[PDB]
């Protein structure tokens, strides 16, 4: 009775469901101020396998939103979806009012800077590693980005300055320097949206404070979603979402969630100690 199925049509429908492609005639995202909306977003990667369930939130332009909660794939799935690394199973994600699945992924990604937990360094010069943020940038901009991220002086001390080979087959950068490369990349991109996934490791007190300050500074005036581990990041966020098992179980600013006296407050009391 499936003698009437058109195999070509099944393959066309498979392709729609399973591949992240631009719609025919998709135009550029019209980026204004970087308002983000998730509306009733679900993400499931098979039958029963739901990693985000009915997730809704709004991040107003320039604001920061911290994602917190126990270990789980939900928090970083939210970052992936905003980047359209996957399509959503249902609901809608919008930037500046526009459904991000209806625009070119290229245009979408041009406005988003990702700062991952682990900084990818290529087997290339330190100049070109920073330049990776925006390949078109002149040497002077690369320098100013390095200067602003606080690694210019270190690079000067490098055996070949900006032409110093780094990465796996190059000079070993410290964890601080590596992180600052990520920041300089982001400065060079100048995106309107930042997706930050905080590292679980930490550096010395002095460096941590300095890096946390640089990060705070590059996120200034930019719409920011962060998968947060540091208390300072959460205390300072415009809004906090507590995610457990793919659900937003509570939300608000730090002080409001403490006085609410739920899951977040319990976590805070546990971290404080007797």
From Swiss-Prot:
Binding site residues for ATP: 45, 69-80
PTM: N-glycosylated.
Source organism superkingdom: Eukaryota
Protein induction: Up-regulated by cellular porphyrins (at protein level). Up-regulated during erythroid differentiation (at protein level). Induced by sodium arsenite in a dose-dependent manner.
Effect ascribed to mutating residue 34 to S: May be a modifier of disease severity in porphyria patients; loss of expression
Result when mutating residue 123 to Q: Does not affect N-glycosylation. Does not affect N-glycosylation. Does not affect trafficking from endoplasmic reticulum
Free-text tissue specificity from the UniProt record: Widely expressed. High expression is detected in the retinal epithelium. Expressed in mature erythrocytes.
Side of membrane Cytoplasmic, spans: 4-274
Effect listed in the UniProt record for changing residue 75 to M: Does not affect subcellular location in early melanosome and lysosome. Does not rescue the normal amyloid fibril formation and normal maturation of pigmented melanosomes. Does not influence trafficking of melanosomal proteins
Occurrences of domain ABC transporter (ranges): 36-270
Subcellular location: Cell membrane; Mitochondrion outer membrane; Endoplasmic reticulum membrane; Golgi apparatus membrane
Family membership: Belongs to the ABC transporter superfamily. ABCB family. Heavy Metal importer (TC 3.A.1.210) subfamily.
Record disease entry: Microphthalmia/Coloboma 7: A disorder of eye formation, ranging from small size of a single eye to complete bilateral absence of ocular tissues. Ocular abnormalities like opacities of the cornea and lens, scaring of the retina and choroid, and other abnormalities may also be present. Ocular colobomas are a set of malformations resulting from abnormal morphogenesis of the optic cup and stalk, and the fusion of the fetal fissure (optic fissure). Dyschromatosis universalis hereditaria 3: An autosomal dominant pigmentary genodermatosis characterized by a mixture of hyperpigmented and hypopigmented macules distributed randomly over the body, that appear in infancy or early childhood. The trunk and extremities are the dominant sites of abnormal pigmentation. Facial lesions can be seen in 50% of affected individuals, but involvement of palms and soles is unusual. Abnormalities of hair and nails have also been reported.
Stated role: ATP-dependent transporter that catalyzes the transport of a broad-spectrum of porphyrins from the cytoplasm to the extracellular space through the plasma membrane or into the vesicle lumen. May also function as an ATP-dependent importer of porphyrins from the cytoplasm into the mitochondria, in turn may participate in the de novo heme biosynthesis regulation and in the coordination of heme and iron homeostasis during phenylhydrazine stress. May also play a key role in the early steps of melanogenesis producing PMEL amyloid fibrils.
Domain comment in the entry: Contains two independently folding units, the N-terminal transmembrane domain (residues 1-205) and the ABC-core domain (206-842) are respectively responsible for the lysosomal targeting and the ATPase activity.
Subunit structure: Homodimer.
Protein name (Swiss-Prot/TrEMBL): ATP-binding cassette sub-family B member 6
Organism in which the protein naturally occurs: Homo sapiens
Taxonomic lineage of the native organism: Eukaryota, Metazoa, Chordata, Craniata, Vertebrata
Encoding gene (name): ABCB6
């Amino acid at each position: 009775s499936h003698m009437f199925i058109d195999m070509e049509n099944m393959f066309d429908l498979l392709k729609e469901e399973t591949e992240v492609k631009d719609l025919p005639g998709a135009g550029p995202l019209r980026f204004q101020k970087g308002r983000i909306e998730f509306e009733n977003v679900h993400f499931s990667y098979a039958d029963g396998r739901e990693t985000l369930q009915d997730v809704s939130f709004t991040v107003m332009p320039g604001q920061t939103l911290a994602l917190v909660g126990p270990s789980g794939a939900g928090k970083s799935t939210i970052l992936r979806l905003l980047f359209r690394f996957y399509d959503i199973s249902s609901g809608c994600i919008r930037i500046d009012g526009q459904d991000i699945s209806q625009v070119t992924q290229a245009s979408l990604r041009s406005h988003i800077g990702v700062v991952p937990q682990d900084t990818v360094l290529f087997n290339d010069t330190i100049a070109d590693n920073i330049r990776y943020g925006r390949v078109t940038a002149g040497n002077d901009e690369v320098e100013a980005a390095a200067q602003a991220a606080g690694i210019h002086d270190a690079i000067m001390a490098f055996p070949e300055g900006y032409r110093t080979q780094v990465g796996e087959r190059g000079l070993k950068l410290s964890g601080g320097e590596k992180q600052r490369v990520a920041i300089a990349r982001t400065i060079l991109k100048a995106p309107g949206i930042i997706l930050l996934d905080e590292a679980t490791s930490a550096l010395d007190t002095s460096n941590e404070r300095a890096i946390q300050a640089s990060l705070a500074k590059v996120c200034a005036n930019r719409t920011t979603i962060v998968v947060a581990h540091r208390l300072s990041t959460v205390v300072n966020a415009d809004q906090i979402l507590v995610i457990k098992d793919g659900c937003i179980v509570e939300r608000g600013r730090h002080e409001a969630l403490l006085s609410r006296g739920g899951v977040y407050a319990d976590m805070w009391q546990l971290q404080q100690g007797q």
